[PDB]
Structure 1
Amino acid sequence: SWSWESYLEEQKAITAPVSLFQDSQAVTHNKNGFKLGMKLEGIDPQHPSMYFILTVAEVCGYRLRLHFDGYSECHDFWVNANSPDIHPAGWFEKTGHKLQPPKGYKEEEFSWSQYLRSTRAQAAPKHLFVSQSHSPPPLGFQVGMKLEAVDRMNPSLVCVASVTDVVDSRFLVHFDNWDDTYDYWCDPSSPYIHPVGWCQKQGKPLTPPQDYPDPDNFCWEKYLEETGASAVPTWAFKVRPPHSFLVNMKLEAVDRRNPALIRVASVEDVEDHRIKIHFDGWSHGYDFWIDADHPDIHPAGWCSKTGHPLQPPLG
């Protein structure tokens, strides 16, 4: 079999130490208890504020492929078994969230008991989920508070934002007057969020809510008065320290073109909070920037220890 050890010798290279990764990205001793066919609840990666009924369509190592019941397979997506974005059947009900029903169902025609009987399926057991809303909420962040946030799809924009959901230790950042397509989950240390008035103290422009009247003259105090909303308090923002990944360090990363695959990778370039991934043996055209805390990058040896195939360098 291909060997990391042999590869490092051949390339005179080094791996990114485990210490540079979050424990969740590095942990390999947890068993993946998810099984083909089990059903559960989870957010739609395309619409992060929404919850759907999902079925385990494939299991591979410490990862699983999820399918949106009743919908096209083209919507399928992969997550790690320790994902905080999935929850046990019944979770939405116990936490006050809304659940979009499977294609073909009206929301009232939905009850997990009838559904499971009609599909002769089993709901994934509760003990397999890291997120069940039993842990503490993020400090200082409550649904309804306002803040300023970088649009990660348009990073040159720091917009007026709100906290619209809180699950365990994370919260959902929402861009005022847009749908949820630009929303993202994060924690108090995210380098993409700032307290109200940040843009002003920085001399950077602030982007007001979509179609806000007379945008050129947006005033936070006025908007907060209009909405009766309060600003996330400044003490709540505890941005994380820049990561310590150095160029040329090697690691393992999920392929962004074909998520089923994980390949041998190297750090091509770095920023304070992101690293540019290069897939050994492939064109640099495939190189991509990714946040250092992304769940899809892991230390060398992750695939082997978890039982997931690792694609060696092209050629």
Structure 2
Amino acid sequence: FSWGNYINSNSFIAAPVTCFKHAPMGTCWGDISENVRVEVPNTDCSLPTKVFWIAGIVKLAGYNALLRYEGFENDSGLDFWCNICGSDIHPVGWCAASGKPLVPPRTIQHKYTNWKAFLVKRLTGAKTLPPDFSQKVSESMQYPFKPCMRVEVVDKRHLCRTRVAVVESVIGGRLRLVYEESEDRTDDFWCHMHSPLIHHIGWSRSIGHRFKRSDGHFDTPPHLFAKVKEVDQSGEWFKEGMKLEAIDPLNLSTICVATIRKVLADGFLMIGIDGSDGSDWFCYHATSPSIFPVGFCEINMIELTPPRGYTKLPFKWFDYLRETGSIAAPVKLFNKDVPNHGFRVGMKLEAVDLMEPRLICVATVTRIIHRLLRIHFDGWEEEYDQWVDCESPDLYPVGWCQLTGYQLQPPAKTLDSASAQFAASALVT
């Protein structure tokens, strides 16, 4: 499987890197656009040694760039895909700086006679990578989470409690965790290091969350954990028994009828899916975009999943509130920003399968409802589509798996004339 070929064959569009709050280089992507010029190996050569040429970005698909050698003009016949963050991608001037040769592609070697004048007139006023781009890329893939670090995380077999887990490995900022005293040896849980699921040692005791009573393993420094958003300070709050709609943490395809079962400290809530010990309950922060007011699904034309075993169907909230003698959580408690992240229906990305989070897959955004993206797994049925927040750390740009070395599941300031002249000095015909 090749993202470039899939995108070129189908005329697909990819979500830009800047759409992704948590993506490597998200906040250094201003320099990257169509017509940026780079120095890259010239594969259109039969020379003993590796040589380079200039190429321009024809198309960007996340981290992946479709490049055209300079001097091909409109001739797309040798257009090639690369990861723009790859180590063979250099700013213009890198050859002259490094004593490497710029050699015309063989295909166009007689198309121009004065190669130095050609390069000067093409490179003068061009956009290239910043000189530290390479270093920003290397820094974007140093993660402060390390093997042997301990965290608190939900027990996937008993959502109502946490237990301690250890980092086994870190790939692209994703943690492979094993539970301490696990039922098996290894590989129990995958999440992003900025997942809201993981907490400092002491978190559960501190907020009132149930926990399983408890090499070289050490407590993750508390400062490494994602900040929790502050709640509305008015003095009106969630109460036990209030009704709402929530994403089922065991079925990310469904939004369900739900109940506030316990108010914890620091804005955390134990929530139950109605009709399904207290063993079932799962913790959402009050600022979670995975919870919604009564009537959210109906107003936004989303299927609501009714309580397991409830027989007055199709489900009507007015009747269920009266039958159960309960009230809706006030709509004001769920007000939040909808960032302008620039996702559009049809855009391609790499998505975590949240029902099997080890898998990162070829995926499409197929619906947008404020913050909420409907994520489709290309080649699978729509029934397996998942509800995912637009700022989720489980969504990646096209090319993220290639950048970080994670396995991808396939579908089922311009240069001045002195800079141009400097760059062109590396020319060997």
TM norm structure 1: 0.65
Alignment partners' CA distance in 2, 1:159 and 1:184? 15
Q: Which residue of 1 aligns with 2:112?
A: none
Which of residues 332, 341, 353 is equivalent to 1:235?
A: 332
Distance 1:176 1:156, change over 3 A: closer
- Measured against aligned partners, the alpha-carbon deviations of 1:45-100 in whole angstroms (never above 9, x if no partner) come to 44333111111122222101111211223871100011111111122333343321
Distance 1:5 1:207, change over 3 A: closer
- Asked if residue 127 in structure 1 is aligned to residue 230 in structure 2, the reply is no
- Asked if residue 47 in structure 1 is aligned to residue 158 in structure 2, the reply is yes
Count of aligned pairs: 278
CA contact (8 A) 1:148 1:195 kept: yes
Aligned-residue RMSD, C-alpha:
4.6
SS in structure 2 at match of 1:84: coil
Q: Which residue of 2 aligns with 1:91?
A: 203
- Measured against aligned partners, the alpha-carbon deviations of 1:138-173 in whole angstroms (never above 9, x if no partner) come to 665446361232573498885351152557566443
SS in structure 2 at match of 1:94: helix
Q: Which residue of 2 aligns with 1:250?
A: 348
Alignment partners' CA distance in 2, 1:312 and 1:207? 33
* Identity of matched residues, %: 24
Alignment partners' CA distance in 2, 1:10 and 1:222? 55
TM norm structure 2: 0.50
Counterpart residue type for residue 194 of structure 1: P
Distance 1:27 1:171, change over 3 A: farther
Counterpart residue type for residue 289 of structure 1: D
SS in structure 2 at match of 1:88: coil
Q: Which residue of 1 aligns with 2:15?
A: 16
Alignment partners' CA distance in 2, 1:195 and 1:5? 43
Q: Which residue of 2 aligns with 1:58?
A: 169
Q: Please identify the structure whose Cα radius of gyration is greater.
A: 2
- Measured against aligned partners, the alpha-carbon deviations of 1:150-200 in whole angstroms (never above 9, x if no partner) come to 57349888535115255756644323674453646265574753259x99x
Alignment partners' CA distance in 1, 2:148 and 2:157? 22
CA contact (8 A) 2:195 2:226 kept: yes
Alignment partners' CA distance in 2, 1:300 and 1:92? 36
Shift of 1:249: 1.9
CA contact (8 A) 2:231 2:286 kept: no
Counterpart residue type for residue 331 of structure 2: T
Counterpart residue type for residue 62 of structure 1: G
Note the residue ranges of structure 1 that are not aligned, 5 or more in a row: 102-109, 111-118, 225-229
Counterpart residue type for residue 302 of structure 1: W
CA contact (8 A) 1:32 1:63 kept: no
CA contact (8 A) 2:377 2:411 kept: no
CA contact (8 A) 2:253 2:383 kept: no
SS in structure 1 at match of 2:408: coil
Distance 1:209 1:3, change over 3 A: closer
Which of residues 292, 298, 302 is equivalent to 2:400?
A: 302
Q: Which residue of 1 aligns with 2:46?
A: none
